[PDB]
Design a protein around this ligand. Structure first.
Ligand code: ZIE
Length: 513
């Protein structure tokens, strides 16, 4: 498709993908590129940097403050007061000033903007963080953290219990706990009252407490997380930790009876001799409809409809897509419809995998459910493609260099036979080196380099009181941490559906090296 034809489609990730393909092949002229940011659904990452090699963006500085941006650190004392305060939003600008001018400006702003006064006078010391911490200036603290992660200091009980009220807190807590940085910040966050935190923050503070073997504080944080989490899946994760720490059998019972299917509820069910959860059986009698499952633009449009449909319209759409050809769309609608409460684990295009052994079938299906929900023309915000969500680079390496498919194009990843074939091929490479389906999942999503580096550490997936569960909470990329948990559940389930059951307890035993 030419640019003129793309311009006629609605804005979507598929349209972006195809504009991106033109850009990377140098087929977009400077003239085509004029009206073009208005044609881009999500102007972020590679499509933006590529478009900006043809047409840089001047923007942006707001017309009201333009004069403020004609001053430098050497002339900021000649700027009016508004201009001074605007430029002092930047800590780099503050760091750049000389100390005499930080004193002058600190006094200028003492009454009206003591937040600026504190940062100015902080930067006249050899440790701005320590100055800010002594004032208990909370906004100042997060501005400094964002300017530099390298500041690290012990924080008293009063100060740390103020940090959770700021929007920055959640990312701050997660970042330092998962990356094992800022040891003094980390230790200090043991004294946060569980009453002052909730949800993810409370959960991460529970993980923090375990790293210091404060099992009682950890319980209290996880319990607060369990009570406040919005998602049943996250709640189950929190209850699991409550159980593992204190072993109250009401916690395990509550976890075993969860309506969310996840590794924690699965494991609880196995520990209590509770039956495997019920899996819906979708078998439409109708064989096809009008819909093109190979048209990525048609998927973008129907997906927008489904995500915007009221309860009543989802019923109309469920009926229309209740065919064998559109089974992945049927199941997507039903999963959307029933409030994430019935369990849908379909096996589409099964002919292409029925010859692999059943364990391999289940790993493939497990990956595809998380990657795409089996939508053949699925496209990610990073333009990973098809049911198995291959990055174009790897798709081209396998397709052209390794398998020498004649006239290979990366869009072949939109074909189920290709998606499953390449997925099998890549999963053999990963599994040969990693063994565990959990490790394979991490490597599939985040790369084998990152996975090998995690497994080479002394403190990850080794022996320990709370292993391997603790390690699974400390996987350094969030996306991959979540992905692995999800794919592993899927794997258990599909192994069960294929009459190739395994106990999730055996999977967990094999994670400890
Ligand atoms: C919270 C959660 O798990 N969300 C997932 C979502 O889950 C549901 C979807 C619909 C319904 N529904 O209809 O109710 C219910 C749940 O499915 C997406 C696939 O469609 C997953 O996207 C994929 O994420 C991968 C990393 O995990 C990434 O490698 C893939 O490139 C990416 N694929 C796409 C097309 O961008 C989401 O993460």
């Amino acid at each position: 498709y030419s640019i003129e034809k793309l311009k006629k489609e609605e804005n979507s990730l598929a349209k972006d993908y195809y504009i991106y393909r033109l850009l990377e092949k140098n087929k977009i002229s400077k003239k085509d590129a004029q009206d073009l940011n208005s044609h881009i659904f999500r102007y972020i990452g590679k499509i933006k940097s590529e478009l900006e090699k043809i047409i840089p963006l001047k923007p942006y500085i707001n017309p009201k403050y333009a004069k403020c941006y004609t001053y430098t650190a050497n002339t900021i004392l000649d700027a009016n007061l508004t201009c001074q305060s605007v430029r002092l939003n930047s800590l780099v600008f503050i760091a750049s000033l000389n100390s005499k001018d930080r004193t002058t400006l600190a006094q200028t702003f003492k009454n009206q903007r003591p937040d600026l006064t504190n940062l100015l006078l902080a930067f006249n010391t050899s440790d701005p963080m320590s100055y800010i911490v002594q004032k208990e200036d909370i906004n100042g603290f997060f501005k400094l953290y964002n300017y530099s992660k390298k500041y690290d200091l012990d924080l008293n009980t009063s100060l740390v219990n103020k940090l959770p009220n700021h929007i920055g807190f959640k990312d701050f807590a997660q970042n330092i706990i998962i990356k094992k940085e800022n040891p003094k910040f980390r230790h200090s966050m043991l004294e946060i009252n569980p009453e002052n935190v909730s949800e993810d923050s409370a959960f991460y503070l529970g993980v923090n407490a375990l790293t210091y073997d404060k099992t009682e504080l950890a319980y209290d944080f996880f319990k607060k997380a369990a009570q406040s989490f919005k998602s049943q899946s996250n709640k189950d994760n929190a209850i699991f930790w409550m159980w593992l720490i204190k072993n109250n059998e009401e916690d395990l019972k509550t976890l075993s009876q969860s309506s969310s299917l996840n590794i924690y509820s699965l494991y609880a069910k196995e520990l209590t001799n509770t039956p495997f959860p019920k899996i819906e059986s979708l078998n439409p009698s109708k064989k096809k409809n009008n819909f093109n499952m190979q048209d990525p633009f048609a998927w973008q449009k129907i997906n927008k409809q489904i995500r915007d449909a009221n309860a009543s319209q989802l019923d109309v759409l469920a009926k229309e897509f209740d065919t064998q050809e559109t089974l992945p769309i049927y199941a997507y609608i039903l999963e959307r419809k029933n409030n994430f409460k019935k369990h849908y684990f379909i096996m589409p295009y099964y002919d292409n995998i029925k010859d692999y052994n059943k364990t391999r079938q289940a790993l493939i299906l497990a990956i595809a459910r998380q990657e795409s929900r089996f939508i053949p023309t699925a496209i990610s915000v990073s333009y990973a493609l098809g049911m198995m969500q291959f990055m174009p680079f790897l798709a081209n390496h396998i397709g052209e260099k390794e398998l020498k498919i004649p006239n290979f194009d990366q869009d072949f990843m939109f074909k189920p036979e290709i998606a499953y074939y390449f997925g099998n091929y890549h999963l053999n490479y990963l599994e040969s080196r990693l063994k565990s389906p959990l490790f394979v999942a991490y490597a599939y999503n985040g790369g084998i380099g990152f996975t090998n580096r995690m497994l080479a550490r002394n403190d990850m997936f080794k022996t320990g009181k709370f292993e391997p569960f603790l390690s699974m909470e400390l996987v350094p990329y969030q996306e991959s941490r979540i992905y692995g948990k999800k794919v592993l559940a899927n794997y258990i389930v599909y192994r069960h559906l294929l009459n190739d059951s395994i106990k999730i307890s055996d999977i967990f035993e094999n994670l400890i090296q």
